[PDB]
Design a protein around this ligand. Structure first.
Ligand SMILES: Nc1ncnc2c1ncn2[C@@H]1O[C@H](COP(=O)(O)OP(=O)(O)O)[C@@H](O)[C@H]1O
Ligand SMILES: [Mg+2]
Lengths: 520, 32, 193, 70
């Protein structure tokens, strides 16, 4: 085994160099390190020219010595795909990290593959109703398209993607794959428990009846792993699309972490940096990923990729490159999230190619364009409202201000998953009902209603019901407040009777710290 | 390489003279 | 096409020339001839000034340097390996890389000659039962079947004992560090006890 | 009990090529690990951060004004 067993030459962080005596591996192939604590998989990214490859390590390189033998697998990183992966959590190399035994593997597919060609593309435009009002009104999602949820650092793009999972992913019929690219590990555990409690993930021997495969390379992982977990989720979704031939969902969380992991790696490969600090190969790496998430003739991948923006900057090149690859774009803003509006969809920046008068109907299209027109004419007057005040505007302008303030509150909606922390129950709105509601507010059937009746309600019935509730309670008054609190017959005990009911805990002698440190 | 393995060439270590003897008479007309 | 593998891997761009030189001279089994020739060229650079002027001056044309290194190395029984090496290293002005290609070649040959060096530094001149008892304790630090040589140095700072200098690891079995680690071990207890 | 259990251990050492800008280009240390806590002769610790092919980059956990070449 002298040939085809290379040794580690040098290590710069997550970048490992292997030097071979003969038969260097092809680029994008997987290497294995002999005698490391965890199974450390390298992945060749370059050829350095002195019989030396330059590998990206899929785990930590802490504890690598520059004499360690590295074997070649002669193949890329290959993950276990098939129907048996339904209900498993996988890392970037295809191991189960949910502790339920090995993965029942139909086939072993590599994660590096060419995108489907031009003639294999499908040109179909059918709507995907999600129940949110801003999505189903102003930027309707293509069923089999690509969806980007921009906005960053606490605007609610991870809540919105759980709402999209909860709405679409159970009424879909096909499978689902959640690829967590560099989001929180706690969020992955929360989604795992919430998918076990909902029934889209089952355990035991009935694992195959589940409809969701989890692939997690979450934000604790080194930048070698976060750069490849999106490709593993793509391989798992592409087995269902290419071989099973049926339509899936692919919710990729924080696809900015893919570009950021490749930028953390490409700082140490010695490449010259591009604009603000990213790699030069941003657009090609993001194309070689994002063009694999496409609906072909045989199947469909309906992807909702959350895109984190850095420091709320849309002219940053890492989301501005991503803007070209998306069909329907849902930009979230913090200036609207600081107004209490939820979900904080920016209505004058979030677009879609489905918003066309030939597809979704001229009624829905004209309602959406009128809503955008009213909000834009409101946005032009914002400095005039700021410095000069509401008391000098025109009549038509201070009517469009009131209509825009009503539709801004009306675009907000309580979510089915957000009620864990807000109390308000979530409302799944149908499509024609919110179209008719916004048609009514655009025509002016609800001018005399209060503005806070539009806040956090589902459809056009519940805004009038909340107006009736909130304009009762300004005139609701009770005489003497009907307490009847004192002198309750055999109800309240004495204070010491309730004190004696309390069982008393003992105190186990000052932290006991030496007894359970000399035990190990 | 280091300096420790490079200072030790300042002492002569050939243990043969079949090159430095002959070409020392040839080098001066070669540069002439 | 079929080159024998070097015994230890090395660095780049000056150690690679030594790796190729050891590979080629091991295909020809002249592995100690070319080491003698490189030693002769090191001392030949030491002797005269018109030869180190071919490696430090940046205004010598490459034509006269190539023709000087060919017409000098035409004769005197020089190896084909060293002749073509010096032709290729004088064509590109890499004659100043001789001093650090021969060191990596010596490290390669020392790996092959299966001989590792050491240096024992002492306070007194060693006697013959001190020496043959020293070799048994110092051989336990080498890691295979080698030919560990034992060099001798004398330094009065040690109060007896020995310190092995392997050029990559150091075994301080001296008494001057034994009493130095003794006085450090007491004062960590007097401050505590 | 300290003399009857006293074996002076073999220690793989390495020279310092250059020190400055919070790094110590350390020659040698072929058996060092990426992220191994190294310890200079002046007592100040360090971490073998960049394991290069020709040296080992060591950041200095402390003031590097006590570290020389050699
Ligand atoms: N629909 C919503 N209603 C109320 N609060 C929300 C909603 N969506 C998001 N939030 C707030 O946003 C916070 C988390 O945002 P998150 O989805 O984690 O965005 P990011 O992942 O970019 O931080 C939550 O604490 C929640 O209070
Ligand atoms: Mg989140």
């Amino acid at each position: 085994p002298a040939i085809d067993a290379g040794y580690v030459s040098q290590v710069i962080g997550p970048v490992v160099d292997v030097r071979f005596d003969g038969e260097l591996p092809s680029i994008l192939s997987s290497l294995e390190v002999e005698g490391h604590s965890v199974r450390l998989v390298l992945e060749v990214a370059q050829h350095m020219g002195d019989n030396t490859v330059r590998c990206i390590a899929m785990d930590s390189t802490d504890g690598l010595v520059r004499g360690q033998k590295v074997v070649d697998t002669g193949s890329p990183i290959k993950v276990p795909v098939g129907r048996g992966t339904l209900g498993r959590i996988m890392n970037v190399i295809g191991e189960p990290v949910d502790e339920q035994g090995p993965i029942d593997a139909a086939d072993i597919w590599s994660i590096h593959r060419e995108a489907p060609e031009f003639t294999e593309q499908s040109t179909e435009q059918e709507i995907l109703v999600t129940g949110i009002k801003v999505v189903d009104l102003l930027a309707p999602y293509q069923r089999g398209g690509k969806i980007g949820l921009f906005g960053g650092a606490g605007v609610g793009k991870t809540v919105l993607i759980m709402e999209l999972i909860n709405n679409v992913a159970k009424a879909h019929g096909g499978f689902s794959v959640f690829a967590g690219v560099g989001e929180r590990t706690r969020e992955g555990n929360d989604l795992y428990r919430e998918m076990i409690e909902s029934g889209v993930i089952k355990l035991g021997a009935e694992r195959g009846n589940s409809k969701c495969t989890l692939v997690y390379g979450q934000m604790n992982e080194p930048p070698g792993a976060r750069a490849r977990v999106a490709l593993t989720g793509l391989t798992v979704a592409e087995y269902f699309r290419d071989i099973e031939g049926q339509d899936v969902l692919l919710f990729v969380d924080n696809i900015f972490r893919f570009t950021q992991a490749n930028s953390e790696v490409s700082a140490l490969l010695g490449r010259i940096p591009s604009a603000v600090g990213y790699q030069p190969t941003l657009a090609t790496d993001l194309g070689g990923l994002q063009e694999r998430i496409t609906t072909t003739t045989k199947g469909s991948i309906t992807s909702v990729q959350a895109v984190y923006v850095p420091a709320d900057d849309l002219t940053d090149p890492a989301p501005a490159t991503t803007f070209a690859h998306l069909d329907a774009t849902t930009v979230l803003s913090r200036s609207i999230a600081e107004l209490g509006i939820y979900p904080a969809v920016d209505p004058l920046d979030s677009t879609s190619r489905m918003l066309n008068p030939n597809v979704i109907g001229a009624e829905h299209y004209n309602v959406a364009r009128g809503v955008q027109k009213v909000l834009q004419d409101y946005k032009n007057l914002q400095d005039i409202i700021a410095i000069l005040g509401m008391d000098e505007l025109s009549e038509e302008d201070k009517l469009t201000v009131a209509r825009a303030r009503k539709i801004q509150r009306f675009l907000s909606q309580p979510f089915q998953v957000a009620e864990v922390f807000t109390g308000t129950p979530g409302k799944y709105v149908d499509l024609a009902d919110t179209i008719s509601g916004f048609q009514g507010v655009l025509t002016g059937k609800y001018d005399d209603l209060p503005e806070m009746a539009f806040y956090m309600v589902g459809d056009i019935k519940e805004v009038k019901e909340k107006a009736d509730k909130m304009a009762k309670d300004i005139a609701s008054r009770k005489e003497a407040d009907n307490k009847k609190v004192s002198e309750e017959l055999k109800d309240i005990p004495s204070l010491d009777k309730l004190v004696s009911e309390i069982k008393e805990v003992v105190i186990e002698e000052d932290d006991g710290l030496e007894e359970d440190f000399k035990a190990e | 390489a280091d300096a420790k393995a490079l200072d030790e060439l300042r002492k002569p270590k050939f243990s043969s003279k079949y090159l430095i003897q002959h070409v020392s008479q040839k080098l001066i007309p070669a540069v002439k | 096409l079929k080159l024998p593998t070097a015994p230890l891997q090395l660095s780049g761009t000056s150690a690679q020339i030594a790796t190729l030189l050891w590979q080629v001279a091991a295909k020809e089994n002249q592995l100690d001839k070319v080491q003698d020739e490189l030693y002769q060229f090191i001392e030949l650079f030491k002797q005269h000034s018109e030869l180190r002027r071919l490696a430090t001056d940046p205004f010598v044309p490459t034509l006269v340097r190539t023709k000087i290194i060919s017409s000098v190395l035409k004769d005197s029984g020089a190896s084909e390996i060293t002749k073509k090496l010096f032709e290729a290293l004088a064509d590109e002005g890499a004659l100043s890389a001789l001093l650090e290609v021969t060191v990596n070649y010596e490290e390669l040959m020392l790996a092959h000659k299966k001989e590792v060096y050491c240096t024992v530094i002492t306070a007194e001149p060693l006697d013959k039962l001190e020496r043959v008892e020293l070799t048994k304790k110092a051989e336990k630090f080498v890691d295979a079947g080698f030919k560990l040589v034992m060099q001798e140095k004398i330094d009065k700072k040690l109060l007896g004992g020995f310190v092995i200098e392997f050029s990559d690891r150091r075994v301080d079995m001296s008494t001057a560090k034994k009493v130095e680690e003794f006085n450090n071990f007491v004062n960590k207890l007097v401050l505590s006890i | 009990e300290w003399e009857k259990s006293y074996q002076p251990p073999v220690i793989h050492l390495g020279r310092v090529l250059s020190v400055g800008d919070g790094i110590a280009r350390v020659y040698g240390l072929k058996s060092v690990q990426a992220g191994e806590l190294v310890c200079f002769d002046s007592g100040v610790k360090g971490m073998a951060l960049n394991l290069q092919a020709d040296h080992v980059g060591v950041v200095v956990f402390g003031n590097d004004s006590v570290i020389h070449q050699g």
